[PDB]
RNA sequence: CAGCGGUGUUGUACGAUAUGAGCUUUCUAUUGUAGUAGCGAGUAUUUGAGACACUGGUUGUUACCACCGUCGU
RNA sequence: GAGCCUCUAGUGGAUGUUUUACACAUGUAAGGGAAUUCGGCAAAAUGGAUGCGUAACUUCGGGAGAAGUAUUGGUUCAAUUG
RNA sequence: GUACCGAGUGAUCGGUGGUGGAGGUAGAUGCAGAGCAGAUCUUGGUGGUAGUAGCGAUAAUUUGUCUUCAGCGGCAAAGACU
RNA sequence: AUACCACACACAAGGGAUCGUUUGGCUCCUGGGACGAGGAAGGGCGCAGCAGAGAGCGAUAUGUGUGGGAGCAGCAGCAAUG
């Protein structure tokens, strides 16, 4: 995986990313959009990104107008098993209370 | 529909018999020269006038 | 025996529409080897088949609406939009007061 | 009227039997090289030395509050100019001296500062300095 | 991405607590005493609060040193 | 058994890109208010219920919802259809 | 039938080398359904325009997972609509 | 004109002209000129070991008698007891 094996847990700024996008389609067009700001965080374009359901269904709370301000997320990079030339960036959904304080980590397993 | 008259049905009987291609033993045969069976319809693309 | 017919099957046996089926997904192959009508009743037994819950709609505010206007609120001019014969009719109170009044006098007389 | 309202309507007579170069058409607008002439210098200074008026007691530099929006604070020497000039703000400009002297009365007139404003550009700016934001709220 | 400073926009968060035009008289222990309440729009305090953005200021953490082609010496 | 919102039952693909000008369906506008145009064409304004108050003319049936004006939410009460 | 080369003012005629696989002329006379650039000619076959114009009125779609072997196909979980 | 457009030649595509062939047509001549209540002409439906169309035949849907005589076109089976 990322150094050490350990896996990085960020924050993204939903709102800012989706800033110029239409409101019809507002979380259609934002899903496109968190994978490309993976990619670029990651220096990686040609990697896939993978999204668990659990973090869909955080996503789609209010329909499709709407989108969370800010969502914390853990990361985990894998060889990608359908072409190992490959690699994958699997997301997962942390829940938290507030985001006052919450930085860049890296976490051990 | 669901209601027939004894002569309507003996047509669809017999339109329905008469619709199938050549067997396939036919075609090995020395002196058989047909390729295709020009008499098979498809109820998309005609009607019967059954009426 | 495609996963389709299977639903199709069971909404027929369960005596609900098919938006209410739900297929068991840890054992495909066991589903897919169903053949008849008695295989899915015993897969319907061992609960790889089941019939889900109905959605909500609650009548919390309908009941709470009703309270309050059998108390007389809301109800005002600006609350009506029919006529005030529409709303409470003229020839049904003219009906109730004059069987009430000859049941009155009939009972006077009769009773001397 | 059918087929759009924002255009010209005749682009010429049958004869000549082509379009001449006087008509209107669209096209680019903007990024052109553009020159204005006599533009007057008011003043001239540094973007961390503070200064004052006669009238005007306070000492101040010249960077508003918050700074210039996609800039931040001056920091090196500056001219302040009458009105408005080409460009963006940082792009890049050339000064020269005037071809020839002007005779018009209102270029050759003296200039004497007594308020130059130093409030926010971000929303409605309504103070001049920190001070006076700490004053008017508490503590 | 977060602190901590700075500059704005909106208008005073959730939850508690107190009051409120009026309307009402419930319970426990036990013979007679003591305990002893409900329902209610709104308003005030905590609270120029809370939310949201930008920072060419400053601290922490995290990521990035490749590769392929063309013309020349 | 209007429009708007939900339960039962049923439902959907020519891919990506924030994407100038001119379009086609729509919003909003200082001061002025038909100056526009063959022509107020298009749009705006009025709108339900309750009360007060209602002209010429008329075949005496009508005109008539004439016109013109006021009221309307939430809560807690009285009184019983006002 | 196809390339070359010669003969004739010309309509046309002759030879050589490849392809083809069973029929063909020179002279004198006889009989005609006997020579094409055109008729908005008749029938059949093919271009330029051009990888262009267009293919998207309506409710709306996302994620995982298996097949499919590469179907927004099927199944789960959400988001919508009549 | 490095790559576009045009023309010439060789090879590969694309189409079906030409030449060679014909169990068909047309014309003239000669014969014939034979249907039905004993159900005609014309229409429909069935019949094969594998059988759609067409040909042949009627629930006896390849039967009887006479004259002949070697195979039944594919696959499986039949045939001098035809
Ligand atoms: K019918
Ligand atoms: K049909
Ligand atoms: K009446
Ligand atoms: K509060
Ligand atoms: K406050
Ligand atoms: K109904
Ligand atoms: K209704
Ligand atoms: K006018
Ligand atoms: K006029
Ligand atoms: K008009
Ligand atoms: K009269
Ligand atoms: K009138
Ligand atoms: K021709
Ligand atoms: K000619
Ligand atoms: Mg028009
Ligand atoms: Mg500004
Ligand atoms: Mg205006
Ligand atoms: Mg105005
Ligand atoms: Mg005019
Ligand atoms: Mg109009
Ligand atoms: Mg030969
Ligand atoms: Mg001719
Ligand atoms: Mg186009
Ligand atoms: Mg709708």
């Given at each position: 995986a990322f150094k050490?094996?350990?896996?990085?847990?960020?924050?993204?700024?939903?709102?800012?990313?989706t800033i110029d996008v239409s409101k019809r389609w507002k979380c259609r067009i934002g899903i496109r959009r968190l994978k490309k700001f993976i990619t670029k965080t990651f220096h990686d374009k040609e990697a896939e990104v993978q999204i668990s359901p659990d973090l869909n269904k955080f996503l789609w709370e209010r329909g499709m107008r709407n989108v969370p301000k800010r969502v914390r997320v853990r990361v985990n990079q894998e060889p990608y098993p359908k072409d190992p030339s490959k690699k994958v960036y699997k997301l997962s959904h942390v829940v938290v209370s507030t985001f006052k304080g919450l930085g860049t980590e890296a976490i051990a397993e | 529909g669901s209601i027939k008259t004894r002569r309507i049905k003996v047509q669809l009987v017999s339109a329905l018999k008469k619709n199938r291609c050549i067997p396939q033993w036919k075609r090995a045969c020395p002196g058989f020269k047909q390729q295709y069976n020009f008499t098979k319809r498809s109820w998309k693309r005609k009607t019967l006038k059954a009426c | 025996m495609k996963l389709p017919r299977v639903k199709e099957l069971s909404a027929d046996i369960l005596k609900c529409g098919v938006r209410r089926?739900?297929?068991?997904?840890?054992?495909?192959?066991?589903?897919?080897?169903?053949?008849?009508?008695?295989?899915?009743?015993?897969?319907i037994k061992d609960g790889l088949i089941v019939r889900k819950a109905q959605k909500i709609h609650s009548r919390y505010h309908a009941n709470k609406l009703m309270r309050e206007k059998e108390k007389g609120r809301h109800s005002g001019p600006g609350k009506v939009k029919g006529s005030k014969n529409a709303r409470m009719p003229e020839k049904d109170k003219w009906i109730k007061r004059i069987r009430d009044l000859r049941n009155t006098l009939k009972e006077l007389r009769d009773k001397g | 009227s059918r087929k759009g309202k924002r255009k010209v309507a005749c682009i010429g007579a049958w004869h000549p039997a082509n379009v001449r170069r006087t008509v209107?058409?669209?096209?680019?607008?903007?990024?052109?090289?553009?020159?204005?002439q006599n533009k007057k210098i008011y003043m001239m200074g540094n973007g961390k030395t503070p200064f004052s008026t006669e009238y005007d007691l306070t000492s101040?530099?010249?960077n508003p509050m918050g700074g210039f929006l996609r800039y931040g604070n001056v920091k090196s020497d500056f001219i302040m100019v009458k009105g408005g000039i080409q460009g963006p703000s940082k792009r890049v400009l050339a000064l020269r001296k005037a071809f020839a002297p002007s005779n018009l009365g209102k270029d050759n007139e003296e200039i004497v500062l007594k308020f130059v404003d130093a409030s926010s550009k971000k929303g409605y700016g309504r103070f001049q300095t920190t001070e006076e934001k700490k004053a008017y709220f508490g503590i």
């Amino acid at each position: 995986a990322f150094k050490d094996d350990k896996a990085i847990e960020l924050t993204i700024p939903m709102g800012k990313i989706t800033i110029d996008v239409s409101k019809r389609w507002k979380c259609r067009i934002g899903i496109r959009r968190l994978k490309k700001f993976i990619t670029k965080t990651f220096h990686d374009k040609e990697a896939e990104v993978q999204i668990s359901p659990d973090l869909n269904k955080f996503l789609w709370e209010r329909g499709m107008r709407n989108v969370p301000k800010r969502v914390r997320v853990r990361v985990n990079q894998e060889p990608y098993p359908k072409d190992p030339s490959k690699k994958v960036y699997k997301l997962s959904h942390v829940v938290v209370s507030t985001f006052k304080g919450l930085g860049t980590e890296a976490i051990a397993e | 529909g669901s209601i027939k008259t004894r002569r309507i049905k003996v047509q669809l009987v017999s339109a329905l018999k008469k619709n199938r291609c050549i067997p396939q033993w036919k075609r090995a045969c020395p002196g058989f020269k047909q390729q295709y069976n020009f008499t098979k319809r498809s109820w998309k693309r005609k009607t019967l006038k059954a009426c | 025996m495609k996963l389709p017919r299977v639903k199709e099957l069971s909404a027929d046996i369960l005596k609900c529409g098919v938006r209410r089926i739900y297929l068991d997904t840890f054992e495909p192959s066991k589903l897919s080897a169903a053949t008849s009508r008695d295989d899915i009743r015993k897969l319907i037994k061992d609960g790889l088949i089941v019939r889900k819950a109905q959605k909500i709609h609650s009548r919390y505010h309908a009941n709470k609406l009703m309270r309050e206007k059998e108390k007389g609120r809301h109800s005002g001019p600006g609350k009506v939009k029919g006529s005030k014969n529409a709303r409470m009719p003229e020839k049904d109170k003219w009906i109730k007061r004059i069987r009430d009044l000859r049941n009155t006098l009939k009972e006077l007389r009769d009773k001397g | 009227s059918r087929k759009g309202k924002r255009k010209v309507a005749c682009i010429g007579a049958w004869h000549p039997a082509n379009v001449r170069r006087t008509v209107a058409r669209a096209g680019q607008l903007g990024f052109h090289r553009r020159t204005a002439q006599n533009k007057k210098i008011y003043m001239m200074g540094n973007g961390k030395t503070p200064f004052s008026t006669e009238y005007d007691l306070t000492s101040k530099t010249i960077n508003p509050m918050g700074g210039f929006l996609r800039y931040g604070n001056v920091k090196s020497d500056f001219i302040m100019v009458k009105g408005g000039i080409q460009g963006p703000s940082k792009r890049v400009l050339a000064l020269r001296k005037a071809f020839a002297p002007s005779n018009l009365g209102k270029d050759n007139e003296e200039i004497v500062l007594k308020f130059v404003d130093a409030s926010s550009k971000k929303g409605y700016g309504r103070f001049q300095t920190t001070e006076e934001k700490k004053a008017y709220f508490g503590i």
